[PDB]
Amino acid sequence: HQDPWKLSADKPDSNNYYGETVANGMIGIISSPEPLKVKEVVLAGTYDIYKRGRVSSFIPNYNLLNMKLAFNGESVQTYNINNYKQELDMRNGAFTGSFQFKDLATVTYSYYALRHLPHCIMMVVNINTQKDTEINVENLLETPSSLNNQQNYFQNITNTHVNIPLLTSVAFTPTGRSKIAVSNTFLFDEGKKLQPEILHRMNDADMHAMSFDKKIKAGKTYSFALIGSLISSDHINDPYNEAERLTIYAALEGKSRLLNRHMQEWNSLWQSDIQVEGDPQAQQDIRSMLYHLYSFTRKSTSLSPSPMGLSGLGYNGHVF
Amino acid sequence: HQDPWKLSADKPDSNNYYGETVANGMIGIISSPEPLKVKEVVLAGTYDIYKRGRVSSFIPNYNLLNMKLAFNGESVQTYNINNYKQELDMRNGAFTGSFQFKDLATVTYSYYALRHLPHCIMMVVNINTQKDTEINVENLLETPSSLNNQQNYFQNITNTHVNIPLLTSVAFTPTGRSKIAVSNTFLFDEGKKLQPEILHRMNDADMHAMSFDKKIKAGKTYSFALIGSLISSDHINDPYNEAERLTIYAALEGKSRLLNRHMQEWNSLWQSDIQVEGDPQAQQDIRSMLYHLYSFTRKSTSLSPSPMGLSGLGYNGHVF
Amino acid sequence: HQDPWKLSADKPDSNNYYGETVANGMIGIISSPEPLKVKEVVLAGTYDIYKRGRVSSFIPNYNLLNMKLAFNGESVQTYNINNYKQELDMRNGAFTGSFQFKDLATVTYSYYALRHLPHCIMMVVNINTQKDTEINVENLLETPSSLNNQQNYFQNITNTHVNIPLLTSVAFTPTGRSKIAVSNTFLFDEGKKLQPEILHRMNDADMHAMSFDKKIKAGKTYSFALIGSLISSDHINDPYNEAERLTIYAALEGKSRLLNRHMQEWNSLWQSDIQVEGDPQAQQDIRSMLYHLYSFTRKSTSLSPSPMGLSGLGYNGHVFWDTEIWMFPPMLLLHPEIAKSMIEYRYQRLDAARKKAAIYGYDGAMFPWESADSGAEETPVNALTGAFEHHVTGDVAIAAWQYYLVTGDKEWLKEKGWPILKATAEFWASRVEKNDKGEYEIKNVVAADEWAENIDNNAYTNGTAIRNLQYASKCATVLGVIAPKEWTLIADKILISKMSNGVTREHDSYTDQNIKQADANLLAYPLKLITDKEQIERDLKYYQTKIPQSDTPAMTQAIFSLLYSRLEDSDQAYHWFKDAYQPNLNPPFRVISECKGGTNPYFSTGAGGVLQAVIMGFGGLDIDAAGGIKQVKSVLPKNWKKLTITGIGIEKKTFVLTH
Numbered sequence A, B: 001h002q003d004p005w006k007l008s009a010d011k012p013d014s015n016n017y018y019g020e021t022v023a024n025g026m027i028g029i030i031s032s033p034e035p036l037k038v039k040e041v042v043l044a045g046t047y048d049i050y051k052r053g054r055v056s057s058f059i060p061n062y063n064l065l066n067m068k069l070a071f072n073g074e075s076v077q078t079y080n081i082n083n084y085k086q087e088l089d090m091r092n093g094a095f096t097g098s099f100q101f102k103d104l105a106t107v108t109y110s111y112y113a114l115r116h117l118p119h120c121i122m123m124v125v126n127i128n129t130q131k132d133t134e135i136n137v138e139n140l141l142e143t144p145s146s147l148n149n150q151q152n153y154f155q156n157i158t159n160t161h162v163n164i165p166l167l168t169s170v171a172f173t174p175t176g177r178s179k180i181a182v183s184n185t186f187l188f189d190e191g192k193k194l195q196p197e198i199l200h201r202m203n204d205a206d207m208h209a210m211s212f213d214k215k216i217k218a219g220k221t222y223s224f225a226l227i228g229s230l231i232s233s234d235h236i237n238d239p240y241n242e243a244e245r246l247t248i249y250a251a252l253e254g255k256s257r258l259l260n261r262h263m264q265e266w267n268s269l270w271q272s273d274i275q276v277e278g279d280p281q282a283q284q285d286i287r288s289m290l291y292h293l294y295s296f297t298r299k300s301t302s303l304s305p306s307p308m309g310l311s312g313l314g315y316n317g318h319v320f
Numbered sequence C: 001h002q003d004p005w006k007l008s009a010d011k012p013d014s015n016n017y018y019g020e021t022v023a024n025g026m027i028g029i030i031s032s033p034e035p036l037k038v039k040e041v042v043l044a045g046t047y048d049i050y051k052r053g054r055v056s057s058f059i060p061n062y063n064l065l066n067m068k069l070a071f072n073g074e075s076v077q078t079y080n081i082n083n084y085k086q087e088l089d090m091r092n093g094a095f096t097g098s099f100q101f102k103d104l105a106t107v108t109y110s111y112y113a114l115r116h117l118p119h120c121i122m123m124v125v126n127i128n129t130q131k132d133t134e135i136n137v138e139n140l141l142e143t144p145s146s147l148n149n150q151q152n153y154f155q156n157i158t159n160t161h162v163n164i165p166l167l168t169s170v171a172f173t174p175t176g177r178s179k180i181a182v183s184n185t186f187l188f189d190e191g192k193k194l195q196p197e198i199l200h201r202m203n204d205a206d207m208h209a210m211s212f213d214k215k216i217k218a219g220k221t222y223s224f225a226l227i228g229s230l231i232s233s234d235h236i237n238d239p240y241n242e243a244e245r246l247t248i249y250a251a252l253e254g255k256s257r258l259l260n261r262h263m264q265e266w267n268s269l270w271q272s273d274i275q276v277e278g279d280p281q282a283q284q285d286i287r288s289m290l291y292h293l294y295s296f297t298r299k300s301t302s303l304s305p306s307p308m309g310l311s312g313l314g315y316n317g318h319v320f321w322d323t324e325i326w327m328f329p330p331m332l333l334l335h336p337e338i339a340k341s342m343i344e345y346r347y348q349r350l351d352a353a354r355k356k357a358a359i360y361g362y363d364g365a366m367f368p369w370e371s372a373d374s375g376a377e378e379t380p381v382n383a384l385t386g387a388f389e390h391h392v393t394g395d396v397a398i399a400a401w402q403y404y405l406v407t408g409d410k411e412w413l414k415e416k417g418w419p420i421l422k423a424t425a426e427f428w429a430s431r432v433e434k435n436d437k438g439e440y441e442i443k444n445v446v447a448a449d450e451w452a453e454n455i456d457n458n459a460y461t462n463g464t465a466i467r468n469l470q471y472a473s474k475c476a477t478v479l480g481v482i483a484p485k486e487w488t489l490i491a492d493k494i495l496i497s498k499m500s501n502g503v504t505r506e507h508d509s510y511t512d513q514n515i516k517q518a519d520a521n522l523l524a525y526p527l528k529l530i531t532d533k534e535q536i537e538r539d540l541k542y543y544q545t546k547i548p549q550s551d552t553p554a555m556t557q558a559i560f561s562l563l564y565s566r567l568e569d570s571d572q573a574y575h576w577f578k579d580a581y582q583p584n585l586n587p588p589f590r591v592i593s594e595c596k597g598g599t600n601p602y603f604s605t606g607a608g609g610v611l612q613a614v615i616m617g618f619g620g621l622d623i624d625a626a627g628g629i630k631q632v633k634s635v636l637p638k639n640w641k642k643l644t645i646t647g648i649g650i651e652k653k654t655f656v657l658t659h
């Protein structure tokens, strides 16, 4: 556990677990011990009256990466997976989970607060089968209790080459001060004709979801990505249309171009570094300190970090 | 044009055309000279301050049956059809349009204000192709300028046997007095596995649509139905959920069971009739008078007709 | 842990803890493993759009009893107390916590949903010192995330005799549908001049608090009470002023008068009781079932319980046939005034049932699958039960007629029973379809076995239609009215079909599918359409193995138990009695979950079915078709030496059964 670039957790213990953050200075995503979920999402620059202090605060935002995975109708849970590991790669702010599901498949998921696109997130899911299986994949947009007056939308953006299914929610901070928009899509390798049909369900007041099925023969790899954009009226006058525009943009840029730009910006940040010989633990600890300051700041802005950066609502996100 | 049960119009002339009404005492649908469109929809019992008189009024409602039909990408236009005819069957309040698209196909469409289900409408579309063709079908829910604060939703209701795609809008009358909900679905003969994929577009502030493509082979008929439910807070405390529930109910009753109940109730109405020998024009005219009174009233209710029944906004829908 | 009146937990374990409820049929308070806190508070009759189902729901409310206690500036926590115990006294619905704080003091706290004051709660705190100490006491009013646009107030109500400090919050349900008000006060023994000064803090957007300090010398007892009132615009047009008025009222009534009235009403409820000799665990379990039904209902109202009562947001607080068929019958026998409130709920909502019938193309009254404030359909639209599970209309009719059979109240039958029975019969007469053979069908329903969707001639559904039409016809006769002759013609020809083995067929597409719950067996009990003991047994034999172990609710095995008791098969009756609820229990208070191994207590529906297995099965008690309560042949479990059931019927009869 003294990798100078990576922080690893074997079998996350939900009774004694403090999540790690990936961030780009605009969005922070804090990890959950649960597979394919995130605990908390924080957007910089969005403040309203909420809980502590009776003053402005950061607001818990859409846990926009939350996914449910089922194998032949069986729901993936902490309790029915094995060899479950989480890892933060401090070189590129990738948070990765990996596990085995019974005798069927190995799953890996990596998510990113894209370093070059302040309002865009991506998760890449890889499924490597040991037997024939059918996966059901659901992405959930649950409006957190911090927001109100939500609307849950779904539509297909199409042309001769693409069908971009957009799962969108718009909601308000407690006093109505800020309108938040989130828009997610699935990105498939196989192209418009062969990609899975996407269903939309609106079964709850505070949650809608998009889902698909996919048959995977034994000994195959199936990969897909979830891209989300998250933005508010503190950042843009029309967050609803800007969130959909951004997700369409990111979908047509594609995973490779997005990850390449992400990697280039993280490589540039790490051109300033601290190397310690003779103390592997100190080397990892100091890398974690640099990683968090780099994740919680952004060149070419007027952003300033709170005492807790984008790791949560510490000190209401205020600057001191 | 002296059929004692049917009113027919050859080649409707939009420069001199007064549409006919189908109604069940709750919803009136007034015909358009344009194929696969309706001019106006009126819901009984729903009043708000609007235009004439500075007093309560009926409100123009969602033109919920509006459909666009295309053959290999070419939209049906009054300029590219021939043998265009419209017919009102006064025996069952069926309004039918029929035309030939170029040399390719014959189209018939019949719609109904379902006599037994006050808040439910159905249109059945039949396409007979003389050559192999692909149809694109779009159902549009345009929020009329009479309504405000609309929301445009779409979802799939599923079980192992069905996928019911719901196109839903919710909006308000001018002062906010009444919440209106409309929910539409396509009903297919061929079953869940074989039915066309339904896409959803939300491109305008006041319009969203659901659509599909279907390949039809030379010498074959393809038939599908559009079912819609239209209800307000004047009729039910939760019109949004009741509209979706009604359309799901109607979809799982199916076209045959809905039309049989409709026909039974119309047959019962025509057990009281007036027959004139020696004057076919008087026979037809008197049948039209009975047809309109039967369409604009409803047994076992507390409804009373306006001077214009459900044919439009005449005298604001008031009872005199 | 086999006290017949008390459920106890030593050292509550927050990693494996399902709280118990105290309730008065209006407010439910669900316990926390944490000292001097409550997990959830639910107010009956308050519904808004919230989370599950996109339909009306109960709303988590103010945790109005939450208190922080500090000893010489040191905060009381789970981690720094010892000998921590919780206890529910089922005799008076008191939830009590007790613990030792280091070398300083013993603390006891008891809270109550006051039985006589629907909107009032009280907690009494006792501190017994082993050394000199100073306590800091804080009561917190945290607006839950379910509510919005809160306002946090504090004021002193004074006269020459009192200073009543009121901590008040007002807030709104998610869509603004309902305004909620809560108002709390501290009540002191020592009087105005000597009582502690109360401070008010407003440090957060969603929380304010009132607090005081008190010095207590070693070897002294210091007691005080927290009184709260919780009420909404669903209950009163001006909840803000009514909540403060109620708390002032309760403060000037005082703790003794409040607890005395509380005790008197609980004593009256327990005049109807079930006593088992030879099985202390069964005695405690059956007392818990009675306690929950008593806590989740209220005489002299139009309230009806959800499947989870006031134990939480289970099934969004909606009312289902869970009342009419599951919780209603045991209450009708023990406390007809509780059953009266349950059917009053439906009577009040008859116009909404008429509106549903008209919207869905039928006559009469079509009760909704799920009901809440208005009586309109509240079922989530993705559940086909809302559109197609029609037997609920017949279930309401059966409960209405049973209310008349047990009470003989002909005035009630004329004013309320007949309106229900006539309108629901008109619904069924419009719902059936006559076939070519002159039989009547009920096509395209969801069965009581809800896994059978959009099928024809469901056994239970068709049976409820038969009973509804028969009972409506009998009701007309009591009132000197000629029922439409069509009701009897239809009732006599509604299809109930058998398979080749002579077993009642669940529906027209049924062969040997697994089923979710009792359906064809309900024709034997409760409908009693099947009386032939060989037919009852053939149906039990075929269907009893059709209910899987997983994801099947507690709406089956209690019926099996009752039917085997009626067949005088003690071993099978007792097998199914235990299976009905023991695999569904959650620690540490043996609360009941919906399904085997479930974690969603408290499933009041399940308790209702089991209480029928005990009263109508082991006790042999039966609603006589001619009127009143009769006793049929029954058996006891081998290990039960005596079963005593008290307060039965309008004559309040005691029944004793032995081997």
Ligand SMILES: OC[C@H]1O[C@@H](O)[C@H](O)[C@@H](O)[C@@H]1O
Binding pocket: A252, A253, A254, A257
């Ligand atoms: O969609 C993004 C891609 O667009 C193409 O037009 C370019 O050639 C690629 O370099 C680029 O990655």
Ligand SMILES: OC[C@H]1O[C@@H](O)[C@H](O)[C@@H](O)[C@@H]1O
Binding pocket: B252, B253, B254, B257, C443, C444, C454, C455, C456
């Ligand atoms: O969906 C409606 C259909 O349901 C079936 O179960 C019935 O047999 C049919 O007669 C009915 O038309």
Ligand SMILES: OC[C@H]1O[C@@H](O)[C@H](O)[C@@H](O)[C@@H]1O
Binding pocket: C252, C253, C254, C257
């Ligand atoms: O405040 C309530 C008290 O009021 C007094 O006037 C009565 O004498 C007591 O019986 C009662 O308990």
Ligand SMILES: OC[C@H]1O[C@@H](O)[C@H](O)[C@@H](O)[C@@H]1O
Binding pocket: C307, C315, C320, C321, C322, C448, C450, C516, C517, C553, C555, C605
């Ligand atoms: O308890 C509420 C509902 O739960 C469902 O599991 C059962 O199938 C229904 O019979 C019941 O009314």
Ligand SMILES: OC[C@H]1O[C@@H](O)[C@H](O)[C@@H](O)[C@@H]1O
Binding pocket: C053, C315, C369, C370, C379, C380, C383, C385, C386, C450
């Ligand atoms: O609340 C929606 C539905 O939930 C299902 O779990 C129950 O089985 C139905 O009885 C209920 O109508």
Ligand SMILES: OC[C@H]1O[C@@H](O)[C@H](O)[C@@H](O)[C@@H]1O
Binding pocket: C383, C450, C451, C516, C550, C551, C552
């Ligand atoms: O067995 C449990 C299942 O029963 C079905 O009838 C309900 O519709 C589901 O909501 C439920 O999860």
